[PDB]
Structure formats: C-alpha cells, structure tokens
Design an enzyme around this catalytic site. Structure first.
Site, PDB file in Angstrom:
ATOM      1  N   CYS B  34       0.763  -1.537  -0.464  1.00 48.30           N
ATOM      2  CA  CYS B  34       0.083   0.070  -0.097  1.00 48.30           C
ATOM      3  C   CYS B  34       0.707   1.276  -0.001  1.00 48.30           C
ATOM      4  CB  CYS B  34      -0.684   0.370   1.363  1.00 48.30           C
ATOM      5  SG  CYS B  34      -1.539   1.301   1.634  1.00 48.30           S
ATOM      6  N   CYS B  37       0.656   3.717   3.062  1.00 47.57           N
ATOM      7  CA  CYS B  37       1.131   3.250   3.736  1.00 47.57           C
ATOM      8  C   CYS B  37       2.559   3.268   4.189  1.00 47.57           C
ATOM      9  CB  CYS B  37       0.985   1.661   4.008  1.00 47.57           C
ATOM     10  SG  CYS B  37      -1.416   1.401   4.193  1.00 47.57           S
TER      11      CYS B  37
END
Lengths: 106, 106
Positions: B34, B37
């Site tokens: 991600c 992230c």
C-alpha cells in the site's frame, strides 16, 4: 475491450511500471480453477467498458506467484486498485457492487 | 525506536491486552503493498521519537485479518488511537497533520 483482451501481467517490473504510468489502475488477481473468478469475468468486462479512464489488467496468481505475493493475495478474485502511481486499496472476493464503488471513487 | 522496530501485533490476545496495558496508544493498520502506508512510515518514525509517552504498534492487515476485522479497518493506513486502556478513535489515511493532532490530544 473485455476480460479476455486486457493485459495479463507476467512480470514484477512490468507490474511496477504499470502502477507508475497509470493514474487509475485495476488489477484482477484470479486463479483458473476458482469459480467466483470466472463468475466475475462478465462483470469485469462491463466495468472495463464503463470506465475507459481506468486501466484494467489481470494476473494469474498461480502463473505469477511473485506478483500475487507482492500484493499479499491468497483469496481470489482480489481486485487491487492504484491511483496516481501507487497502490491504494484491495477488494476481496466476487463483490461486483463493492468493486464498482471502489473504481467509481478512483 | 522507529516504524521498523515497533511491536507488530500478530494475534487478538496480544492486541486486546496491549490496549489494556497502555495509557496512550497508536495502532498503525497497514498493508506492505500500500503506497500511502509506505509514505507514512518516516512520519510514524518521527512521531514515535517525538511522543515517547505514547506506545506505537503496527498491524499488517493481510497477515492479521482477524485483528483488522475487530477494528473494522477498511482504508489503508488506519491509525487507531487508545487512551487509558481502551480504543477511542481513528485517523484514516496518509494524513500526518491529522494524526499528530490526534496523538497530541491523548
């Protein structure tokens, strides 16, 4: 274009370059033995036609286990969404409504 | 310490008891693929060092889907904040300003 004619990812650098080059991306991680993946093929073809500003590709998790692993895919189908050069979200399972909502929000 | 060194929650017993043990807590629910992230990792390291009275831990949503479900995590990253032995709220997304504000309020 349709499920049958979209790019089928075969390589990790290829995958990384697609993510970087595409401002809206959907990756269908599927398996050929997996029935819900087959069920989702007509839905994907519809979404491909409905969202021309989104690039749709697919990836066989068993043929390309490194790419599946990179995206932590162990349930299929998994739809991985990318926006503006990065992966942002994942939709797990044969959920046409949730998938459209995610794509619509890209 | 840093994003790389903080405790990673790997089971529900650990998740629940660590919440109970801490008077100020941040749980970073993330995924390794991600982009948002990954973006937040350097921010978290700076916040960990800036707020040594706050316990930061992290949880990989693909590795620990049971814990993610318990916090009803949908968006990546999701920061779940805890105060006085219980979870109190969330900060959703790669928003360092909003995350720091929430931590300051603990």
């Amino acid at each position: 274009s349709s499920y049958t004619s979209i790019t089928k990812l075969t390589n990790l650098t290829e995958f990384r370059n697609l993510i970087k080059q595409n401002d809206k991306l959907v990756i269908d991680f599927y398996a050929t033995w997996c029935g819900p993946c087959k069920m989702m093929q007509p839905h994907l073809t519809k979404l491909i036609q409905a969202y021309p500003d989104v690039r749709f590709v697919k990836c066989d998790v068993d043929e390309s286990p490194d790419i599946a692993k990179e995206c932590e895919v162990t349930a299929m189908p998994t739809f991985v969404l990318g926006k503006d050069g990065q992966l942002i979200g994942k939709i797990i399972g044969a959920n046409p409504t949730a998938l459209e909502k995610g794509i619509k929000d890209l």
